[PDB]
Design an enzyme around this catalytic site. Structure first.
Site, mmCIF file in Angstrom:
data_model
loop_
_atom_site.group_PDB
_atom_site.id
_atom_site.type_symbol
_atom_site.label_atom_id
_atom_site.label_comp_id
_atom_site.label_asym_id
_atom_site.label_seq_id
_atom_site.Cartn_x
_atom_site.Cartn_y
_atom_site.Cartn_z
ATOM 1 N N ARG A 93 -27.318 -23.065 -76.961
ATOM 2 C CA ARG A 93 -27.396 -24.126 -75.488
ATOM 3 C C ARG A 93 -28.110 -23.255 -74.389
ATOM 4 O O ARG A 93 -28.207 -21.965 -74.310
ATOM 5 C CB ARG A 93 -25.725 -24.565 -76.141
ATOM 6 N N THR A 132 -24.128 -38.052 -90.917
ATOM 7 C CA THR A 132 -24.919 -38.304 -89.576
ATOM 8 C C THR A 132 -26.006 -39.606 -89.665
ATOM 9 O O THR A 132 -26.469 -39.576 -90.987
ATOM 10 C CB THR A 132 -26.249 -36.775 -89.901
ATOM 11 N N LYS A 147 -23.035 -28.050 -94.255
ATOM 12 C CA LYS A 147 -23.306 -28.425 -94.117
ATOM 13 C C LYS A 147 -24.894 -27.039 -93.903
ATOM 14 O O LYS A 147 -25.194 -27.213 -92.779
ATOM 15 C CB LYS A 147 -22.867 -28.419 -92.806
ATOM 16 N N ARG A 166 -11.825 -36.529 -92.441
ATOM 17 C CA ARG A 166 -12.770 -35.608 -91.810
ATOM 18 C C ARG A 166 -11.409 -35.238 -90.211
ATOM 19 O O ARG A 166 -11.784 -35.756 -89.068
ATOM 20 C CB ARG A 166 -14.235 -36.375 -91.341
#
Lengths: 462, 462, 462, 462
Positions: free
Chosen positions: B73, B278, B220, B32
């Site tokens: 963010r 994760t 995802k 990955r």
């Protein structure tokens, strides 16, 4: 539309090419030649007529030679007159063939009668009309006590319930008849009065000695010894004929039905044809309709799972042969349509899965690339709803498969590869009229294996 | 030999050819590349090193490009110092990027912040550390009342539970990263923050515009919207990565487990690869052994039925990368060992039967002539005990199949007929060391059908 | 209404009558008293407060005494200062308690340390922080070579993986704590560090000597020996507590998950209550929300089929006790909802059928006339959708049944005949609010049989 | 040991108390009085003799009155001489009863003959000996074309395949016969020629008007209309008699077998007795052994699942009545022993589970506390291996249960509670000799419910 196959005994009323053609239309699949009667000329003409009808119409049928077999018969009587036996009286059999009979004694045809019997045994004469109990055996005589009143005619059959009889596997006439069957290239030999493994082998050796190694042997189970050795006999045979009438004289009457169910079940599991025979539609020798009971008996044999049902006198000598075939086909059609599949080694795994797949995709046809009969019978074992289209290059195999339930045989030139099988089978499936564009067919064969291994299943849309 | 596949994020400690070789030994199947960090030179070098190792050792592996993705963010703070927000206080977000933050207000990176939120919505800052409720939206300001005490640092992620967010599917950097991936010929693209069908489509049109039409897209799932539209997204994607950490911030915590089970189940039904990712073995960034909990979480993901499990920081930056791969492989083996097959379209029927046949004959190997990935994935759907050996002529397909559970891909020159496949597949099955003389193998393929139809199953002895 | 039961350790923040009442509302079923801490006055007060709350509110709950247990701990250090052990160095343990430790040697609390270890064994210090290999055993010294760097503090636990340890079943303090429990009439005793059958037996003989013969013993499985002897221990115990944290230090980490599954399965088959404990929601000692991982671990324990789940520090000392009970209840409900029944002795046959009957008639309630706990547990074994209403005349039995999954106990004066049970059970079923007019209930009992035989099932409409 | 019950038509040869006692030993369960013949004196004496034999021997049996029914018969002929009808000739029926017949015309007994028939219909005369097709209907005449040669005697039955005939449900003689049956307290009335729901109701009302409300009505299905309305008829009846002989004249012959299987199946599902009747062992009127076919027919009806089989002439007038009962019992025993249970609303749930439990515990006996017949028949539905011991306080119910397969009825004084049932049933189970100490029995009853609800099943060891 029927799947169950019909065997017809052909005789004087039905031997013409005209009749045979009408018999096939009505549902006949297999011709039975009963060698209890007729000479080689009559039987040869019957084989000729069918093959003419087959050649002209392109229809398939098999030919089955049913041997007369060895037997125990009583002999002649004074003045050829019946004698009236009284319950309780003494009566004697003699092995001396020269003796003319009367109310006290008659001769039998079998030298071994004194040897094989024992004090206490039951002797039945003339399809169980007269029953006697052996009270002494002395020299060449079997002395008995008659159990029931009855009239003794000349030349009647004798049955010995539960006795192992040392008659040969084949009568001398039988041995000639089998050479005839090889000469004529019959498809099946139905061997009478089979009692043990060694009888089947003796017949196998005799056929092999006359180029008959490819003739399938159907063993007729007729007595208790046959039943006792059934597994042995099935192993050596290619199939079984259930002789209900004979069993009705030889074993307890309440057992005959379960002997028929047992034998059919085991033949299906063993992947070998079974024929249910005798006492099917006998009333139609004389009448244009069967009885309710005869209809019910035939249908229950189909439900038991027989490959084929058999007509005897009702198609050979009877007054209504075409009626009897036709109503038989109707019973077959009516009963076959309400039967379900029975889904419960590489071959069993692939074929059972092939049928399960056919059902889950509502496929009308399973196309089988059969080396010999093995592969088509391995599919038939699970009672598919779908019809089996069995491709073969072997003409004898094509004829023999006519007898298996729900199998449509097809003679083909050759199949050189697995993809050719798929290409060719799809064409022949459409041509057969058994399936149509958009239907699913399941295609079964062996690939990179010795013949008689089925390892490949394939699903195609037409 | 484990069946579950391991995805390893490669970083500075694991990028050398020496380490990659040892990573593959330890059980790595897929590399990955996390494009949140590193530049094109670094990633290109990792791609080069792996391919060198693959050429020298003949081992197969796939390459997965994972995009950074679009994000929301917070911005900067006065003196760059943490500020302490107190529950109940008023706090405002502004879309004005020029504003430096403090105890009362901070800027965010996303102008659409005012648009997509509604009075009553929840705003989470820094992986849900601080939670806020929108009380008013006015011009370029979202006024909130803080729900819990916490410390607000600079540049922290914002999550908007249950909110549909109108960020583009791809950031500008993502678009460039994806072209790089096409140029480099990666096997997989893992697209971050997929929320709806159109996001997957926009990525596919970006890839197809740069020669990436054969690059498989792994979506995802990270938030509530993604979960709501999961079916749409699955339909459009080639596979799914379950981002458990992100889902724990976006949806109620007791739901995360079932969202992982639901998504894995549906990927298997759809014949599309799924990666569980994760919060797997994060403690091994620092420690040479995982936590009991971490081992248990991984194992239950395999039991749920995931194709692959993923290592992140623990293999890229961590102090014990090989330890983390090894213990992951150990868990995969220990958990794979106790799993059973899951037996319930022509393809569906044939593949399900082939697995059932394999188990019933104790076949160690199912050999699949796969046109693309579909057919091997169609067999894998039933969780066979047997290992899947997948023949393909396409080198990209071969790489991609590395990610499917229990699949060993094999590049072949060609197979010109069905019988050729059997001959070759038996040779390759022996060569693979996966089966031996006398083993049964089940061989699955298509015959006289369009690619991606599986219609044929065949059983062979080696 | 959740079915899985919650055990809560009660401490200073949760001991008041006010808190206990709110704890019960939040889903607490059983109070755990951890005798590692607190004195008899404090624990007696907690017992008193609960019983007051129970009397005032009519709610039912059980009381569980959890023993400290025997342990092996390291001793003191020079200047009480941490020492840094370096991998490869020599380090020695001594059974001499007078020795103060340093970088080279420390004392342990257990004299048998020399006896039970063998050269080659692994010694773990401080929950496996530092691992050591025994290289020699000489007099009162166990010489080891350190395997990993780590810091050695004072009084740390020692674990000896795979070693059979000869500590007594009960410490001296334990024996006193158990008498206190008998005096106080607790419902359950959770015995720490159970390793073999004889440990359970020694505890039962200690309880039976102080009037505790009706106190159910829950054995805590904590190490490899316990796991090896699990069947023995289950046979002798009334139930099992799975101590996952301890098992993570004693056995290989990939095994812990399956050891929890194995043990839970066998408890259900044995009709003995099982508690899943340790490392459940520990992060909520500090935080008002659990981790995604923590929620997932708890849920998979319920899915494995645990009767009960346990809160430790998070309800005794933590900052958010009610938050932890509440979110535990939420997970229990969310997970219980998706579970199905598990249908496969006279008792076994009748109870399995009663559940099957309940499901087939959509009965919300199974009413059990339980002689002791056996019969309600025999119904619970099949995981009924229906709630179990358990009638008993014994107040201790009623309390103990609170710990079984999906069981609501009901104290009754008496039931004198089978028809009386039906009459009364229908009344109580309506009163319980658990079923309503027109619902079907299945009523299970014994008739003309010894207690603990269930031979009767009966279906009634309310 | 047999489960299938035997109905015997009693006549001159078998009416003595001596014979009846021997008939019961041989296996007779139910006495049939055929009211086609005999007067009230003869039938009254037969009822008297049986009840004497029952009183003296303590054996149970039921009494069944079989009505003559309404019919269409031809009438008299010139000189009482047969006339020879030729295929192709015209032949006429007249409704004018005064007409004496000849080769061209005969009278019929039914005025409605012209009304109910249509040009094209088939008229069968003398059990289908002669078939004719109606060519015109004119005034009081039905003109036909004869289809087959045959001889027409006097007073022969007529059948009209597929015609709905407007004869009354009951002949005038029938109505008197039913009053007799009430006067005599017969257990069953078998009603002839039932065609639709309203016939059953008319009979129900007539019995009710004479205190016969407790006499169970067995509807005889004899023709196509009966078949068409079978469900309606079953609903109103207490049972069904399958008249195969009649159906063989009325419907296509290949259908009779499936009409018999259909009707039996539906009676079992409906929990109502079925009797298979006519053409069972008819050859034994004259011979001491049945035919193989007759044996096979009887056995297949048992396999179909009939409760009872019936003897007609072979036990009333035949030369070998005791032989015919005995061989019937043997067929019953031989066939019953190889049958398996059929496990596939509160009553169905409890009884099906009770049987399943009996089998899983190898219980020889299921003890049923039956209110009326319903509950014992609800257990019999699943074909238990175990014998059903049916406790009843009702003497008529005890008699009627004699007809149900595998049911042993037992008259008891009373049962005051559920536990008394268990105490009493265990005693009566041991006393019956049907079970022994240590055997398991399953005990079935209703508790706190209206009669004819079965809600309770209980397992006990004797």
């Amino acid at each position: 539309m029927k799947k169950t196959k019909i065997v017809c005994t052909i005789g004087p009323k039905t031997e013409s090419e005209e009749m045979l053609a009408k018999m096939l239309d009505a549902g006949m699949n297999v011709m039975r030649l009963n060698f209890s009667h007729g000479d080689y000329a009559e039987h040869g003409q019957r084989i000729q007529n069918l093959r003419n009808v087959m050649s002209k119409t392109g229809k398939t049928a098999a030919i089955l030679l049913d041997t007369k077999g060895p037997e125990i018969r009583t002999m002649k009587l004074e003045g050829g007159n019946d004698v009236s036996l009284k319950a309780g009286q003494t009566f004697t059999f003699t092995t001396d063939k020269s003796v003319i009979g009367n109310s006290e004694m008659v001769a039998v045809t079998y030298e071994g009668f004194t040897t094989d019997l024992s004090v206490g045994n039951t002797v039945l004469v003339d399809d169980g009309l007269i029953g006697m109990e052996v009270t002494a055996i002395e020299g060449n005589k079997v002395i008995c006590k008659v159990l029931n009143n009855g009239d003794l005619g000349e030349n009647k059959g004798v049955n010995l319930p539960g006795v192992s009889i040392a008659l040969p596997a084949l009568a001398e006439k039988d041995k000639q008849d089998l050479i005839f069957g090889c000469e004529q290239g019959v498809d099946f030999v139905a061997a009478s009065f089979i009692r043990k493994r060694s009888d089947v082998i003796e017949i196998r050796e005799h056929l092999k000695a006359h180029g008959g190694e490819n003739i399938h042997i159907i063993s007729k189970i007729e007595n208790q010894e046959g039943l006792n050795n059934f597994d042995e006999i099935l192993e050596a045979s290619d199939g079984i004929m259930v002789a209900r009438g004979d069993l009705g004289v030889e074993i307890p009457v309440e057992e005959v039905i379960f002997a028929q169910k047992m034998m059919i079940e085991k033949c299906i599991r063993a992947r070998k044809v079974v024929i249910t025979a005798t006492q099917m539609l006998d009333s139609m020798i004389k009448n244009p309709r069967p009885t309710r009971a005869e209809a019910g008996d035939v249908a229950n044999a189909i439900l038991d799972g027989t490959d084929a049902v058999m007509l005897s006198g009702e198609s050979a000598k009877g007054k209504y042969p075409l009626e009897a075939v036709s109503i038989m086909a109707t019973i077959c059609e009516r009963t076959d349509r309400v039967m379900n599949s029975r889904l419960e080694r590489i071959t069993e795994a692939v074929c059972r899965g092939a049928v399960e797949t056919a059902e889950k995709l509502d496929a009308p046809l399973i196309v089988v690339a059969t080396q010999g009969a093995k592969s088509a019978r391995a599919v038939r074992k699970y009672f598919p709803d779908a019809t089996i289209l069995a491709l073969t290059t072997n003409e004898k195999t094509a004829h023999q498969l006519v007898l298996s339930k729900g199998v449509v045989p097809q003679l083909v030139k050759e199949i050189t590869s697995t993809d050719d099988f798929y290409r060719l089978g799809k064409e022949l499936a459409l041509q057969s009229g058994l399936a149509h564009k958009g239907d699913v067919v399941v295609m079964v064969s062996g690939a990179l294996v010795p013949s008689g291994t089925t390892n490949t299943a394939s699903v195609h849309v037409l």
